Structures are given as structure tokens and as C-alpha cells.
Amino acid sequence: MYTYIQNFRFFAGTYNVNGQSPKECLRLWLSNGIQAPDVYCVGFQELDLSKEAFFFHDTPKEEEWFKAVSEGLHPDAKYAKVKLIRLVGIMLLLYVKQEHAAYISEVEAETVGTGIMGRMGNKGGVAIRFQFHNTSICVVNSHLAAHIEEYERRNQDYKDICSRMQFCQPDPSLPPLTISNHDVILWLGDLNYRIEELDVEKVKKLIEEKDFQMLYAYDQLKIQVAAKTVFEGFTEGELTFQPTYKYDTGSDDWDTSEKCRAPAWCDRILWKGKNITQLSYQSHMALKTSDHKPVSSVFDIGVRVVAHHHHHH
Ligand SMILES: O=P(O)(O)Oc1cc(-c2cc(OP(=O)(O)O)c(OP(=O)(O)O)c(OP(=O)(O)O)c2)cc(OP(=O)(O)O)c1OP(=O)(O)O
Ligand SMILES: [Cl-]
């Protein structure tokens, strides 16, 4: 046989749905005029805020949002469900075009709670890793700790995900698979890093003026990554969309409750590995089901394809 690099189109999405059932068609998120992706990696947070889901019960929110997403994928291609994984309200879905189904192997999913008592599932991460052709890929969906002052807990949450997430090994004599041990890592979710120092009315005003350079200079994720305390070697595209948190339900108004929570770029998509090229990075204002807005991104990722020759002598 022989081998070559081929670009396939990866969509990555993250959406914190605030414990709500889907009430809106998700084509605006998943298939907004773009070309049909080869792979869909769709992640959720706060799927179900009930006591029941928190204590590991099954939730109808799962099937509800799965169908919502299935129906939302690009109508020009037939998509195969590869894998679903959920811890409490953190759910990751992996689809691929039916063409590619035969070349997906070694699918493993795992979860890690980092919430109450540092081990429950109100916060944490879930991951699906797999081999597409001869490229190892791991997709991680995490919901890190809330609130401005808890940036150091968000750091630790990231650490625990990174050290506890262990995938199964076809060869038992080798060390278990960790997230790092992959050709391609996409990390998405409500990473929940807020705006430091600046006060609430400053932020909104700075957002109203669309100066996303000055606001970004005080973004906690940037800061911490700069201090090399989290996400070493990861990259993120330029943020050309306004903060994706926190809104009033059913509108584009900033949280008007008594908490009057400041805006933030809670919901992010980061990556690491070779031959990854980000084509877009967008939020989707139209969808008003949640107090967050959903965020998408499309990559051209170069996969190592091993194939058969045609008669060529
Ligand atoms: O790359 P891999 O390792 O697979 O090896 C090869 C397979 C075929 C091949 C094998 C077939 O089936 P079978 O071998 O019977 O399983 C085919 O179906 P067919 O028998 O229906 O004709 C075929 O026809 P298409 O071109 O794919 O239609 C091509 C040709 C190759 O080039 P060449 O012929 O120039 O040597 C070749 O490279 P190599 O030179 O390295 O051997
Ligand atoms: Cl499944």
C-alpha cells in the first residue's frame, strides 16, 4: 500500500444550554451556509441541572439534544453516529460522513468529574478519542468552575482532567492513553474563564464599542495561558464575536437578574497537533434558548491516509 496526507473538514461546537430542553432548530449553529463537514464534534454543558442527573440518573435531555443535533447537521450528506458520552450535563457527540465510517477505529470515551468535593459531575470533562485513517484524534469537552475569582480552580480542574482521563490500551504492556498522546487534540467547552479587574459597566461599554482587543487583554484564559499555568501548546483563533455569556433567556440582553453577572468569553475552542488549519470561529446570536450562545469552528485537518494503489504499471 502507500500513504499520503489528505485534508478532511472538521466542525467543532460547544453549547451551554442552561438545563433547558431544545426549543430551536440547530441548523443555524451546525450548518449555517457552510459546506458539509466530514466530521462533527458537538459538545454540551448543563444538559440537565436536576438533582437526579447530578446523582448519575439517566436524563431525557440526552435523547432530546441528540435528535436536535442530528436534525441540525448539514442536509447534503448522510451522517453516522460514532459515539456519545455524557457525565451529568457534559455531553460530547461524534458524527462522521457515512463515506468515512469504515476508516474510524479504536473509539474510546471517558469522563472526569471535578465539581463538588472535587469529584462530582456538575463540572468536569468528557472525551472521545479515535483513529481516523492513520491519525489519532482526541476531542475533549470540559465545563470548568464558575465565577471570576475561581481562575485557580479552573486551572486545577484542567490539571485533573489531564491527569485522570485515561483511555483503554489495545496493547496492555504500554502506558495508558492520555489526552496528550494523540496526533490531534481539539479541546472545547465552557472553560468559564472571565474578564479580570475591569468592572461590569466597563465591560459592556467596551463590548458595545466592539474593541475586542482591549477586552481580550484582560481575559483570564489568555492571562493564565501566558503564565503557562494551563493549556500548554494549545492555540486559539482570534475572537471576532462578542462575549457568549451571560444573557437573559429568550433574548440578546445582558443578564438582568439581581446577580447582574458580567459578560465573558466562557465558551471557547482550542487545539493542538500538526496540519490543523482553522477556517472559522463564530458565535451564533440567533439562538436564544440559553443564557449562553453557542460557538462553532471549522478546521481543515490533514489526516495520514494509507490506501491501495490502482494498476499503474
Ligand atoms: O497498494 P496495494 O498494496 O493494494 O497493492 C496494489 C494493488 C493493486 C490492485 C489490486 C487489486 O485487487 P487484488 O490485487 O486482486 O486484490 C485491484 O482490483 P482488480 O483485481 O479487480 O483489478 C486493482 O484494480 P483497480 O485499479 O483498483 O481497479 C489494483 C494495484 C497495484 O499497482 P500495480 O498493479 O501497478 O502493481 C498495487 O501496487 P503494488 O505495485 O505495490 O503491488
Ligand atoms: Cl454511543
Curated annotation (Swiss-Prot):
UniProt binding sites for Mg(2+): 18, 46
Subcellular location: Cytoplasm, Cytosol; Endoplasmic reticulum-Golgi intermediate compartment; Early endosome membrane; Membrane
Entry binding sites for substrate: 46, 122-123, 245-246, 259-261
Region: 5-phosphatase, residue numbers: 5-306
Tissue expression: Platelets.
UniProt note: domains: The ASH (ASPM-SPD2-Hydin) and RhoGAP (Rho GTPase activating) domains form a single folding module. The ASH domain has an immunoglobulin-like fold, the Rho-GAP domain lacks the catalytic arginine and is catalytically inactive. The ASH-RhoGAP module regulates the majority of the protein-protein interactions currently described. The ASH domain mediates association with membrane-targeting Rab GTPases.
General function of this protein: Hydrolyzes phosphatidylinositol 4,5-bisphosphate (PtIns(4,5)P2) and the signaling molecule phosphatidylinositol 1,4,5-trisphosphate (PtIns(1,4,5)P3), and thereby modulates cellular signaling events.
Family indicated by similarity: Belongs to the inositol 1,4,5-trisphosphate 5-phosphatase type II family.
Subunit structure of this chain's protein: Interacts with APPL1, PHETA1 and PHETA2. Interacts with several Rab GTPases, at least RAB1A, RAB2A, RAB5A, RAB6A, RAB8A, RAB9A and RAB33B; these interactions may play a dual role in targeting INPP5B to the specific membranes and stimulating its phosphatase activity. Interacts preferentially with non-phosphorylated RAB8A; phosphorylation of RAB8A on 'Thr-72' disrupts this interaction. Interacts with INPP5F.
UniProt name for this protein: Type II inositol 1,4,5-trisphosphate 5-phosphatase
Organism annotation: Homo sapiens (Human)
